[PDB]
Subunit: 233 residues, 6 copies
Amino acid sequence: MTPHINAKIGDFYPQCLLCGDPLRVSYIAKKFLQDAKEITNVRNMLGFSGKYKGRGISLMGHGMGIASCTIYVTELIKTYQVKELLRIGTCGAISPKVGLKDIIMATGASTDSKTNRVRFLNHDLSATPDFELSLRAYQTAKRLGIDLKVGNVFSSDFFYSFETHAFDLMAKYNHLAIEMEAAGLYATAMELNAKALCLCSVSDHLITKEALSPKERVESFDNMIILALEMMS
Amino acid sequence: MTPHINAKIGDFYPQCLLCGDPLRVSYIAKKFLQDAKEITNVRNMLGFSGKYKGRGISLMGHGMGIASCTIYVTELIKTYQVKELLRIGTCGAISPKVGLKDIIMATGASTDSKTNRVRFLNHDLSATPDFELSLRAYQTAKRLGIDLKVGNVFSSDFFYSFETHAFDLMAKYNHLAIEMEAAGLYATAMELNAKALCLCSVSDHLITKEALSPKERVESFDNMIILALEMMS
Amino acid sequence: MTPHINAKIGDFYPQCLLCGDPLRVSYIAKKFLQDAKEITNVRNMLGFSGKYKGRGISLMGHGMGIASCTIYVTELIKTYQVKELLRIGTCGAISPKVGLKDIIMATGASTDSKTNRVRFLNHDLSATPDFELSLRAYQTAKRLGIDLKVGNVFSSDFFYSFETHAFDLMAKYNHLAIEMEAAGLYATAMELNAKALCLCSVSDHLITKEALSPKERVESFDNMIILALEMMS
Amino acid sequence: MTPHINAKIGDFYPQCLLCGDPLRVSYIAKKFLQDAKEITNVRNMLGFSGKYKGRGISLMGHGMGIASCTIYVTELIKTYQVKELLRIGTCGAISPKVGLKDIIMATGASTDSKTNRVRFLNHDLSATPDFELSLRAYQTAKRLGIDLKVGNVFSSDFFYSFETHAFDLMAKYNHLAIEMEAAGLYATAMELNAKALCLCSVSDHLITKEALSPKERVESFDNMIILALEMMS
Amino acid sequence: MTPHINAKIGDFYPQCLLCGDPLRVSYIAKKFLQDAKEITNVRNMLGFSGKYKGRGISLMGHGMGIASCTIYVTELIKTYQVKELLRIGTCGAISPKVGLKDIIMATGASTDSKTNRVRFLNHDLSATPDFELSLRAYQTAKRLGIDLKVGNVFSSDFFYSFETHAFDLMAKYNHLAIEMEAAGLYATAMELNAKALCLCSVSDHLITKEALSPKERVESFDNMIILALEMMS
Amino acid sequence: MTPHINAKIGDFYPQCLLCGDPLRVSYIAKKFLQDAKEITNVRNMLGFSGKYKGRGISLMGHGMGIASCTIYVTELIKTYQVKELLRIGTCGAISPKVGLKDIIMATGASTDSKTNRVRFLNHDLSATPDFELSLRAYQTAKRLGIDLKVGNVFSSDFFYSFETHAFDLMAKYNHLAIEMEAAGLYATAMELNAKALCLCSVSDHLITKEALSPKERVESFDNMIILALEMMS
């Protein structure tokens, strides 16, 4: 149907959760959704549709990096009529204002990619989420007893960075964590007039070098899953 | 005291309203503040402190352009201990999603300036406001019956643009209006761990050419002044 | 051992074939090698070890885009001691010098990514494969009766391009096709002193709009696989 | 008449002296001009028209930073028919070739702004003054016995620099001092076929941290005012 | 004694004429110098010392392109203690303010080269000549009755331009003609604290499409050779 | 018939050898080619035609620097129908992988020039040689018992480098040596669909600080000239 998704037209609900890892998406469908159905599996990049509290939710994996994420987000919006995209995932914290198990809401995504300069006149595109989704995240968190840590993330083309000396400057300008897709998810949604947000769970702190156990990673991520599913229903 | 502000240390309250035009600042102090006093007038750039709803509120003009804005808010934060900065002004609309008399909340500020590349490793800094201020703005607007328009603005180094052909692309990427300081205000407050937000009043639509009358301009700006003073009080 | 590969130490042979699509990796293992074993499956990105003419060879998926490829190639080399990396995939031809079913050998990978500027002093890194590997591909292609097309590819961060007007200029400068990882593969191998080559199968011509049928794509990819395994044996 | 200038057509003489501070423009009017008349006061940015030794001369403030300066100069040239723009002011000296009380003629204005790459094809524009104006300055400086230092100046977007370590390299390349607008003045006059020149007075040496006193500062600026008024009458 | 000049210490005079064409240099030696001797010839690039009307004067070729001109200029200043360098040659006119047999004095050289950004913090270096030289060239051409045209040139890395569409814009910004070295000549003299200037003869006009006859060519040139030699004595 | 080459059409053979130093192409003409003949001498840039083991061969000098090399390669290809261009010269070694007297085949040419960004959409053009020339060079050298060292060179605009600290990073990314032309040759030949290759001999070593004596020069260069003539014959 598209080069990277083999779902039937109409297989996706208009609200879609996203993770880089398709096995995480599979985890969510199996453990949290009723009547979950795998609807796409091209390149092993799984997607699902199902129900949370009687409301249709879709789930899609998008792979690693801005360019992979942009492909899947573009197709979801343009072909499968997805309207709200909520990306959840882990991110490595870089600021003293956050600690392990915090959930970060990215109200901006800085980047070392050239993609937004290519998209946007070789100027500075401030890649931002949709405000209404941000507000709904904030209200849902408060009602679930989650204190969201709110600021920028830095979306890098590099997992193994050549600029680790720059993390302090990043944190100084209110970047709470690093990840690798948010700047692309946001720019793509701005391009295509869709609503997007990125929420990140802090499982590793890149400055203090603290890190969650395997058991603390699943329970931490489960709390962010419930935040996400509750703000979509 | 500073080369551009001759206020005594402690003359500014920790919350400050900003406008580019110091005569607008003077107008606010006279008409809307209780017991206002002029606290600075270097280079004719006026600033005031007064009371609103029994509460201390400061006003400061910052001139035109990112470079001028950056001078004044660096000094307010680092010398005068200002903690919260709310910028209000007019902005030229470029998007069909906004019309005359709308108030825009800028949740991102793109730019053609080099200043953030200089600040931020030659990468893309997503210049964003403080989320708690933006939440306060949204809730106050709602109480006042204001239908707040929320999106990016584009902060240009050019009043007379050489890139008019690009306003449609800017609008496509959710830039609601163009102005000349938000990116610098946001970057500087990010740099200095302060809270900032820009609100923009639509007095002219740059695409469809419609314009407010002189009386409608006064009313429109007054509506924004009330919003601003109510969210800080 | 790494965040993205769960193979045991020594699971990888020092020669490794790469594809973006892990399911093609899996196909090669099941159809073309003997005693094939799945050695890694983090994020559904499958990797294999097996034998071709009794010589050990490994296979690994690397996902889409320079950022994803760079992660997997960095890890293969630094942790798993892989020394020779040969990437085969499909590409979108932009030059009249090539047509459907052609196999392109990328002696250079131009890019619109910023990653090599970040890696290399903000100058122009000419990302290139290992000559001996490319010499070896040429000799194997001749002794196989394959008419190897030879030239540059363009690695883009965009599957859905914003610069399709530029494909003719690219073709002028001897870019035969467009893909999305070569420049990252080549730069990573240059950084880490390993040997890499990208081979490119034309299944769609982006100018003439010709395309292969599903049956023909199977046949065309199978020949490229043979060239790859032969030059590794 | 223009959004930023209050004057009626013909209020401005074709020659105009400029400073960032409107209160210096006001000081020049009162102390040095006969029949002086305030002709514009938008945003408290003052301008005047008067006579010096029977010659009609205009004065205009332009605020701080390239963007603010560019607004005012554009409107002076394109609406008020100003042909010759002479900017005087202070500047922080960075060169061992100059010292307190020296007056510098800016034969080039380097910048960290992006505005000239926006104007000029993303190449390097050498912003320069009009030669005939620079000759009149040299000739008038000699007639008055002023030892005119001649060289480049660096126009920064930052009053509070993030690259103070770079001042030595600037001086090495014959930048005598730092200010914040000459590069935009020069580029605006080049765009609009007008004659512009910048002179600036050293009352503070940024490297040796020598400063003038609140007494020699007044007389230094007077010396420069007289030089400017002379070379225009 | 340098890798590119095989002259002896002291064999250069502190005033030197340069051209890209060494064969044009000999023409100046034979037809204008008394006691003329060839002093260097590596890579067939010729230089001369002789006397003009009783004042000693050197001549040197510098090849084509900024990088070539930078090599020779650097060695002339650093090793042979040249202090004044005057560059003459022809240049394609692009402005309607100049016609054939006009001599252009370049008060600024803009460029599409990256060399000055590498020299100068990736900012905009305004590459300018030494003022007192330019003042000399002005006085000399006047009592010699030459109507010297003064403005900018654009130094390109490209003789065969890929941006011919842009000459009009260059002309708008007071670029009278295009050549290929002035930006590197001026920047190198700034870096090493020497005094340089560049003069330019219009023999071809790139907009209008005239060309001088071969008769008028080394006729217009000699009028500028004379101008040059006159302003060194 | 071009502004920089004197020869008549028909004087150049299709295969052409290139050097920067025109005295060096003269050396080659007198020692190695029978029926040698000088065919151009504009700007003292000499070219020659003769025979080697029967087949006709041309020689041409091109000066120093990408801009200079580009003028000549362009005129050669476009006016004089040259179709193979083989560049030989000396290069400063920067890698431990090569020692003096080694012969380097440049399979890619990185650069600090802006010229390829100007040519190629401000992206990263990977400048590479024609693959068949490089295959000829390798088969020949193997027959002549020469151990060919293959990798990138770095083409710089700077002979006297401002980034000497970066040579280690260049060599880490498989840059064996530095020169000033290869990226311009490779990109001009890509632009104009001609076959080009660069070879250079290591007479000095920039990191270890060796050299060859005046006569070790001449002999190592001869081993390269014989490689070149053999592969064109």
